Amino acid sequence: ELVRKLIFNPQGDREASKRKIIKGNPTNIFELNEIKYSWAFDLYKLMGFTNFWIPEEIQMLEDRKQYETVLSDYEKRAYELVLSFLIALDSFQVDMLKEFGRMITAPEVEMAITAQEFQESVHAYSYQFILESVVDPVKADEIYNYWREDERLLERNKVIAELYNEFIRKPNEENFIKATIGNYILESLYFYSGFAFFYTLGRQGKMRNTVQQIKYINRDELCHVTLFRNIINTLRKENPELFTPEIEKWIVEYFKYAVNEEIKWGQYVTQNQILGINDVLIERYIKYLGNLRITQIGFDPIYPEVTENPLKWIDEFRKI
Amino acid sequence: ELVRKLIFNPQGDREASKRKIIKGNPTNIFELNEIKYSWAFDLYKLMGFTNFWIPEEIQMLEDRKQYETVLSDYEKRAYELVLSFLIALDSFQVDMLKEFGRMITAPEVEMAITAQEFQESVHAYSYQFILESVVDPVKADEIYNYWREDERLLERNKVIAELYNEFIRKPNEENFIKATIGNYILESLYFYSGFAFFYTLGRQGKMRNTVQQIKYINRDELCHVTLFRNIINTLRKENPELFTPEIEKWIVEYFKYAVNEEIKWGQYVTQNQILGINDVLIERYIKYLGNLRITQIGFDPIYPEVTENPLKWIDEFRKI
Ligand SMILES: [Fe+3]
Ligand SMILES: [Fe+3]
Ligand SMILES: [Fe+3]
Ligand SMILES: [Fe+3]
């Protein structure tokens, strides 16, 4: 039962070395002359200053043309579905990162979560820019609300929410580790179906404006995955009494499930009607990412049959 | 008793016009194609993009010299006291703005609070830069910890915390309005003693490096005061059943008290030993700011005898 740190604790540890990710005894003054988690502070500077960007300084002259005329009915359908879902995710993220930040006892980590929260706000801004630019008013509202029409979308949403609401409802150390694992999956996996879609269009000279935006969001997402990787790993060291077998189990299940559901989504969005990728490929990408992410947090691959990356080209395309 | 909005509400209002600052019924998807609070969204763009800045791109070559040799024992004392306190305030702010953000039901306002939270993180970074630059390692740790020595500082801190902890402990609509009023005072008042100090040094060519930093923090602070002014005013319209007489009373008391305690601080810091301002001036500044701020949230002046600004010159100096 995670007690939320009070605003000022005069009986708080002076030694940065005594800091913990959770359940530490801080003053809650940001004593940033001493850093225990150099990665937390490095990631703050990287997200907050180095990688700063302005959505509206990206030019949206073309895409509205290509949307208006050059895109197939299936290509427009995927565009709507992917943007609707990513809008939902980034919305959940700005809201939920405030729950993590208020529970974390290392100020440098709180700093890194604050910057991540701000990056999620900019993403929300970028999607609003993309739609204000690329499509008409009614279509933009419809895309924001596409869950109101599409039960596969509505369910993806309610499901992601559920895991976060457990921790909000019942803020215990188990529901914390579960929520944190949820965050890592959501940013590990659930963005890269969408990222892959847009980078396909972009390979063939389709929607290069949108794809610029996405390159920045994707640069930010890799920082976010790295932050939560370190938090989960540091959480394992500092709190092994939380990575019980029952949990280490529930992790690998959800991590497999999630790799599944991302594929059932990638396939619903596209339906092999998109010139550049197919239901087979989808499966080899998510399976690939999923292994990686789970191994990067100290677990055995969940799909050993996969070891190459189907789309190794992305790594070079998405670059800025 | 403010129930904290769940992460996704499929029974949430579609019409932006139905949004409320608190106790609204949102989906918690950031439907930013429709804005009800244009000021909230304007303030987000202003804080997040327009006014972006990097503390470390400000040059800190000189100040360490002027600190090392050119500053009186009283001038060094004020420097330590003011920086120690402002470090404490910005720390409280990054932490507490997460409590407001999670309670607010208008996404554009949540967006504006997220950006403010990020600006508070940058301030934390700026103070760490200032001390890493301007003073030696042991002195920097001592300044972060100056509350551990100085009971006037320790009490200022515990007092600000107290008001925030009430709302955290007992998150009801009264403790919400109290906490929110606390935020407005803290950013209205408690920064401008410090701001005034540093701008004095800076007038006489003392610590112009620090003073650059402060100009940026002060530009950010005016955005923050404006945000909470609008929130309190919009809260009055949307929730008059909260600005009871008992509250409207407790407001004017605290607002007067706070103008008092800022002066008892300004005077402890300086002690008329600082060439540029005196215990009399201090009193005419805080009394001036305090009236203004309380009138700007629809109240009668608390010090009518004051109507001019003692230090009208600041407005022009602090500019960038
Ligand atoms: Fe995002
Ligand atoms: Fe993210
Ligand atoms: Fe600040
Ligand atoms: Fe502020």
Residue numbers in the entry:
A (entry chain AAA), B (entry chain AAA): 8 to 327
From the paper:
pmcThe enzyme ribonucleotide reductase (RNR) synthesizes the deoxyribonucleotides needed for DNA synthesis from their corresponding ribonucleotide precursors. Class I RNRs are composed of two proteins, a large α-subunit (R1) and a smaller β-subunit (R2) that exist as homodimers, that combine to form an active heterotetramer. Aquifex aeolicus is a hyperthermophilic bacterium with an unusual RNR encoding a 346-residue intein in the DNA sequence encoding its R2 subunit. We present the first structures of the A. aeolicus R1 and R2 (AaR1 and AaR2, respectively) proteins as well as the biophysical and biochemical characterization of active and inactive A. aeolicus RNR.
Another possibility for the low radical content and poor occupancy for the second iron is that the presence of a reductant (TCEP) during purification may have partially reduced the tyrosyl radical and/or iron cluster. To address this, we purified AaR2 and AaR2_genomic again in the complete absence of reducing agent. We determined the X-ray crystal structures of TCEP free AaR2 and AaR2_genomic to resolutions of 2.15 and 2.10 Å, respectively. Superposition of AaR2 with AaR2_genomic (without TCEP) with their corresponding structures (with TCEP) shows the overall structures are virtually identical, with low RMSD values of 0.22 and 0.25 Å for the AaR2 and AaR2_genomic proteins, respectively. The AaR2_genomic structure (no TCEP) on the contrary showed clear electron density for both Fe1 and Fe2 in the active site. This is a significant improvement from the AaR2_genomic (with TCEP) structure, where the density for Fe2 was much weaker [modeled in at 0.25 occupancy]. The resulting crystal structures showed AaR2_genomic had full occupancy for both Fe1 and Fe2, indicating the presence of TCEP in the purification buffer was in fact affecting Fe2 binding during crystallization. TXRF analysis showed that AaR2_genomic consistently had a higher Fe content, and the activity was double that of AaR2, regardless of whether or not the proteins were purified with a reducing agent. This clearly shows that the intein in AaR2_genomic enhances the incorporation of iron into the mature protein, particularly in the Fe2 site.
